[PDB]
Structures are given as C-alpha cells and as structure tokens.
Amino acid sequence: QVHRLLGNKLELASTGQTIYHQDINLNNHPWIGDHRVYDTPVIPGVSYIAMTLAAVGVPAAVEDINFQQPLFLAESNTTRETQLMLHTADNVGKQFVEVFSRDGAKQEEWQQHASMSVSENPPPPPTLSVDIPALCEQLRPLDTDTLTEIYASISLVYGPMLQAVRQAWIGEETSLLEIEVPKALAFQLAGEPIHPVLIDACTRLTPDLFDFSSDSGVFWAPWRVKEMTLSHPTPSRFYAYVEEPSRVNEQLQTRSYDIQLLDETGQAFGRINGFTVKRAPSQLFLK
Amino acid sequence: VHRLLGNKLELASTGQTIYHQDINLNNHPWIGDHRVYDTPVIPGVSYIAMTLAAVGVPAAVEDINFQQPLFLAESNTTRETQLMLHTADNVGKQFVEVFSRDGAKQEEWQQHASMSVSENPPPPPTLSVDIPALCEQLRPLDTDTLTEIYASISLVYGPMLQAVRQAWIGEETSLLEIEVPKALAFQLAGEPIHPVLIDACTRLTPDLFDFSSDSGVFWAPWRVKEMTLSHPTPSRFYAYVEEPSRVNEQLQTRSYDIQLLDETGQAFGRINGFTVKRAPSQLFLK
Numbered sequence: 001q002v003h004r005l006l007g008n009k010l011e012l013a014s015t016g017q018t019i020y021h022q023d024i025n026l027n028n029h030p031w032i033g034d035h036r037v038y039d040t041p042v043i044p045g046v047s048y049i050a051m052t053l054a055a056v057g058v059p060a061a062v063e064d065i066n067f068q069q070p071l072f073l074a075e076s077n078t079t080r081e082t083q084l085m086l087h088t089a090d091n092v093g094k095q096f097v098e099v100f101s102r103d104g105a106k107q108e109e110w111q112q113h114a115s116m117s118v119s120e121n122p123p124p125p126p127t128l129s130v131d132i133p134a135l136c137e138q139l140r141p142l143d144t145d146t147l148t149e150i151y152a153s154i155s156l157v158y159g160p161m162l163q164a165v166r167q168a169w170i171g172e173e174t175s176l177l178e179i180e181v182p183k184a185l186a187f188q189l190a191g192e193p194i195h196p197v198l199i200d201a202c203t204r205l206t207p208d209l210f211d212f213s214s215d216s217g218v219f220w221a222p223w224r225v226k227e228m229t230l231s232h233p234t235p236s237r238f239y240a241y242v243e244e245p246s247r248v249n250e251q252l253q254t255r256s257y258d259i260q261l262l263d264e265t266g267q268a269f270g271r272i273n274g275f276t277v278k279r280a281p282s283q284l285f286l287k
Numbered sequence: 288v289h290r291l292l293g294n295k296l297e298l299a300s301t302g303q304t305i306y307h308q309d310i311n312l313n314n315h316p317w318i319g320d321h322r323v324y325d326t327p328v329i330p331g332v333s334y335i336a337m338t339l340a341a342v343g344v345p346a347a348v349e350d351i352n353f354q355q356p357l358f359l360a361e362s363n364t365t366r367e368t369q370l371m372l373h374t375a376d377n378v379g380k381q382f383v384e385v386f387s388r389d390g391a392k393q394e395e396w397q398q399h400a401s402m403s404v405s406e407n408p409p410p411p412p413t414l415s416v417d418i419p420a421l422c423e424q425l426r427p428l429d430t431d432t433l434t435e436i437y438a439s440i441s442l443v444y445g446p447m448l449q450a451v452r453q454a455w456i457g458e459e460t461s462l463l464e465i466e467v468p469k470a471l472a473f474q475l476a477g478e479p480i481h482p483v484l485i486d487a488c489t490r491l492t493p494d495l496f497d498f499s500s501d502s503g504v505f506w507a508p509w510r511v512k513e514m515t516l517s518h519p520t521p522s523r524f525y526a527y528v529e530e531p532s533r534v535n536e537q538l539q540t541r542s543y544d545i546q547l548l549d550e551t552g553q554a555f556g557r558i559n560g561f562t563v564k565r566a567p568s569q570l571f572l573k
Binding site: 010012013019021083085100102110 | 296298299300305307369371384386387388396398
C-alpha cells in the first residue's frame, strides 16, 4: 500500500537504505496547485522536512537542510517521478536524506530538490512557555488582506488549500501567527506529524514583513534551514512565534529568521532555526 | 510487472536498478515442483536467468556464487525478494545481488546469490555439432534411471520441472534434449531463458552415478565461473557435456561444463565451471 505524503516504501536489502517513491501531480497532490509562485504550482522547500519527519517519526531533529531547484508542475497534467532517499545511519548515527525527481513522461535527467540530515539526537524537551491571551493583548491584530498583497508583490499566491493562517499579529520586535488546518486540505491529511502546508504556514510572517522589498515582483525562495525540531504532531490549532526581526546578510544576500511552534496553551513543541530565503527571479527559479 | 523479475525501480541517486517481487507458490507455482528434501527450493541458476532477463542477451555472467537457498517452508510462505543491479563500474562490469526475507516475520535479509555481468557480451556463435551423428555414437538412457539418481540425493522434479525429453550417455560425453514442460508453458514471458530450462542443462554428466547416492545428502550448486548466452532458447535445444566432472577431494566439490546447442546443433550458450557441493539438510535448510 501507499502513504499519501511519502508514497511507496522500499527497504533496500543491499544497503539498509529506504526509498520512498511516488508520482507527484495535481491528481495525487491537488494542494500544490494552490501554492503558486509566478502562477506556477511549486512545492515549497519545507515540504521535504515534512516528508522526512513523516519517514522517521517524531520527536526528531533535522539539520543542515538545503533546497536546490524547485519541483514545479508546468502543465495541468505534469507528473514528476519523485524519490526521497533515506540513507543508512553513519558512524555518528546521522541519516542523510535527499529528494530527487524527474519528469514522468519524457524520462529526463534526475533533478535534486533537497538534502538534509536527521540528527542522531532527539531534540531536548521544549522549555519555552508563553501566556497566549496576554500576547494577543499587547500586540495588534492584522487584516490578512494586507499580507496577501505582500505575497502577491513577490509573485506568491496561496490558494484555498494553503490558507492555514487564521489570524496574524505584529509588534515592532515580535510576530505571531494562529495556524489551523485549511478546510479544503482536511481530507488530505494522513497522520503525518506535520503537513507541508502547515510547516509552510509557520514561515509566512516576521516582525518586518513590510520590509521585504516588494516593488520588483521577484520571489524570496527558501534556500537553507539550519535546524528544525518537532517533539510531537501538530494539534488542530497552534501558533508560530518569531522573537526577533529577520537578519539580513548583504554581501551574500539572504534574509534569515527563527520560528517557535507553540501549542494551544502556548507551550513550545517545535522550532525552525536559521530559516533562510534568497532572491530568485523567475528565469533562474523556473529552471 | 514482469512475471520473472517483478517490479523495476530505477534509483535516482545512484543509477542502480532494483527488481522486487513477492515470491510464493501463487506467483511462481513451478518452485513447488523443484523439491529438495521435500521442500520447494529455488535452484541457484534461476538468479542467472533473472540477471539475463534484466540486461538482455547476448550477455555474459561471471563469478557467480550461491549462498543460502530461497526455500518455501509452508504452502503459504511468501518471501519478499530483491535483485539489485549495480551501476556499472570503471571496468564497466555490473555487480548483481539477490536477497530475500520472510514477508510475515520481517526477519533479517538473507543473500541467495551474487555475480557480475561482464563488460562485453559473447561473440556470435560460430561452432556447431551434428546431433544425429553424436546420437549414433552415444548410448540412449532411460529417464526412470535418472529420476532414481535424483531421488537418491533427495531431489525430485515435478511436472513443471520435467524439461528433459531425452537423455544420452557415453563414457566421455553426455547429451540432454530439453524442451519447455507443457505444465510450465503458460508461465513463460519472453525472458531469454527460464530458471527451469537453465536448471535442466545441469542435470547430466558422463559420471553421474559417481555422485554419492548413499546417505541421501543433496549436491547443491555452489558457484559458476562463467555463463554465456547469445540469444533466447528455442522451444527445443540440447545440453552437451564434453568431459567427466572434475572432483576436488579436499574442497569437497564436483565441477563441470555444459554447452548449449540449438536444434541444428549450433552452440548458442555455455555454462563453465558449474560447481556442486554436498549440503546436508540441517545445514542446507537453515
């Protein structure tokens, strides 16, 4: 049989590797059609973290995450033969993970989309608490339309199956997102710790989101993530909390930030460290 | 899904190919007709047939080794099997491994075979034999006589393994006429050579009586130096052995060579250094 997110599991007798293989298209994964960059369905990078977390189970920690070329679906019927390769643990006990795809029909050359390592060490148990009704009493709520325009300004549009942001708050130094399972997406969930969309939603706000120079049309593509930890599956409703404004590297041209995942009570249960985006014009990005 | 190889998966990362399938009496009823110690077992040469099906003929396969056999203990036993075709190396040879594990118990993987696909295939056959002229100077042999020898090493060929139409024997040479068993016919699927047919080529040598029929202990295929095949087997062909089996007292082995000859008597394949070794039931089926 076959997991909705990972596809088919194959354990390699020779190596002790594990391959998860599936055919990705809008039939299998209609949600991609609602994550549109330059009006092209594209899989956001954090999806591969989601997949890896689904393969190894939580609690888990994933480190040195890199995104190469995006997996995009040019045409309505485009199928990409996709493979997530989970390597056999090394001497330090780390598991290397890599995600490749090639076009189904044409039988093209394999393109890599992601690499990362599963840490040999379970993250240490979450320490940061938060009083949630107090945060929403010292911040100032956002109109979601204001955010939609910012995304549209960098050629990003979130369709019905990506609209997971219930409410947004902003301060001068901090930001907070209230995140839930989009009604359109609900049917597609399959007991994976965190769906690609939900982890993507965590990355949608920073104290200084009005700063991300808009007037060019050029997209900010996720490029690397230092560390991502998750202690348990996401609840039906949770929060994404950013404590400091994004760090802007100039000479190497990247914006980076941190996100704390907080449950219903305001208890931390996951985090994303060093979430880095880089400018990617459509000529370079779309391949 | 190819009936013989199962499902093909090409690895993105390495350029390797995995053929994976569930082996059982349902998928492969013929195994039930190759019984050693009254246990359905896959003959070693099957994995050569599999490899030949993966890469195509003409082809040569070298340094073939058989480890633990794949056997089906119970009538419903399923073993998930994987044939791994490695990406070609510097010399351009492709390493091949066959593993299985129990479908139910999810035990540890057991290896059944390893071999290398040669960088370059055999040259188009030129040499040829006159079959009737060879048969005019060989003593025909009754099949019952052979069935008894196999039974004495705890080997029994059922209807789907009964590929030997006729057998001849001389002092120095042996000859087998081989055809597709009527019970097996429907299972063939365009593979160059079916496990059964390659197995049948190994069933006679000029000195077959000198195989110890005394304790019921089986002679298990252990290694093969080279196996070459130029084209798919015709519906009827011959297996020719030119010299008596070489016996290694010390290593406890018997080894021999088999020439595969078509309907006209033209050679189109061979098996070199086909080695059997004594394998008692306690060691063999465990």
